[PDB]
From a paper:
Whereas yeasts only have one Aurora kinase, metazoans generally have two, named Aurora A and B. Mammals, but not other vertebrates, also have a third family member, Aurora C. Aurora A localizes to centrosomes and spindle microtubules and plays important roles in centrosome maturation, controlling spindle length and bipolarity, asymmetric cell division, and promoting mitotic entry both in unperturbed cells and following DNA damage. As in the case of Aurora B, phosphorylation of this threonine [which readily occurs in vitro even in the absence of TPX2 or other activators (16)] promotes high levels of kinase activity.
To gain insight into the remarkable biochemical potency and Aurora A-selective nature of the MK-8745/MK-5108 class of compounds, we determined the 2.2 Å X-ray crystal structure of the human Aurora A kinase domain bound to MK-5108. In the inhibitor complex, the Aurora A kinase domain adopts an inactive conformation in which both the αC helix (orange) and particularly the activation loop (yellow) are improperly positioned for catalysis. Electron density maps indicate that both Thr 287 (which adopts two alternate conformations; only one is illustrated) and Thr 288 are phosphorylated, showing that the inhibitor is able to interact with the activated form of the enzyme. Consistent with its action as an ATP-competitive inhibitor, MK-5108 inserts itself into the nucleotide-binding pocket between the two lobes of the kinase in the same orientation as its parent compound VX-680. The picomolar affinity of MK-5108 for Aurora A is explained by the extensive polar and van der Waals interactions it forms with 22 residues throughout the active site. The 2-fluoro, 3-chlorophenol on the opposite end of the inhibitor packs against the side chains of the catalytic lysine (Lys 162), precluding its active conformation, as well as against Phe 275 of the DFG motif. This interaction stabilizes a flipped, inactive conformation of the DFG motif that is intermediate between the active “DFG-in” state and the canonical “DFG-out” conformation. The interaction between MK-5108 and the side chain of Trp 277 has the effect of “pinning down” the activation loop at its N-terminal end and disfavors its adoption of an active conformation.
Residue numbers in the entry: 127 to 280, 286 to 390
Amino acid sequence: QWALEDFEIGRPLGKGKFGNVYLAREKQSKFILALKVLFKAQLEKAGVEHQLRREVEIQSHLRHPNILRLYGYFHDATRVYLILEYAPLGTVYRELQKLSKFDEQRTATYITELANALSYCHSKRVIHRDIKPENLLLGSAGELKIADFGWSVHRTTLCGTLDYLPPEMIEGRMHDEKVDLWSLGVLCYEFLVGKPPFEANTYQETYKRISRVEFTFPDFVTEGARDLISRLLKHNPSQRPMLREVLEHPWITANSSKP
Ligand SMILES: O=C(O)[C@]1(Cc2cccc(Nc3nccs3)n2)CC[C@@H](Oc2cccc(Cl)c2F)CC1
């Protein structure tokens, strides 16, 4: 159905992994959107071509205000095109770099939006969202948009991004939606501190620190934040909180801007 000629392509928004993304406009409807270009050769070489295919298929049936909407996709012999919701304010990652760390209010609000999205995802049996700051885009009102279409990987090939992977994903082959509770904890930490909790010199050391749940807090992290993060970063996934509990955490309640 869709083809490149169905769109009026504008300026490049930026260069990402596997290709550029363009501000664009569907011809007939004049609807403004983002067009992500992905080169098949780079997808194959990076080992993520099958993940991307699965993700675009799953997410084509999903709709949530804090998930970057995927309107559709198409391909030729060379490239894959994603027709995406346009998120004007770019990645949370750039803001995190600019500011070094976020305050508790912006953080709790981000954690809220992420928790709502992940709750929706789980109801749809969609799990293990790679919600690292690079994959978090910003709507025109500063609302967070999960934009993970399966293009990061890390014997067995693991899906996602090392610093955010839970112990069960690195130690074993079985895991459920509780992995998304672990990620939420890493992100909350990262938001407040400026770096993820298990950051180490090498992959292997990161691999081991995650297994041991070996991390420390800086002194400035408040008690409520530490409490949430500590609950989220539990080794046994069965011991991790449910998303409802997160959304009703006193530190979240006391600090988030929205339900
Ligand atoms: O410089 C930046 O901030 C960007 C480009 C950029 C800058 C400003 C706004 C913007 N808005 C957008 N709305 C939808 C897609 S991009 N996009 C670099 C490329 C990056 O590429 C991606 C990253 C993760 C997931 C996805 Cl779908 C990506 F397309 C997006 C941020």
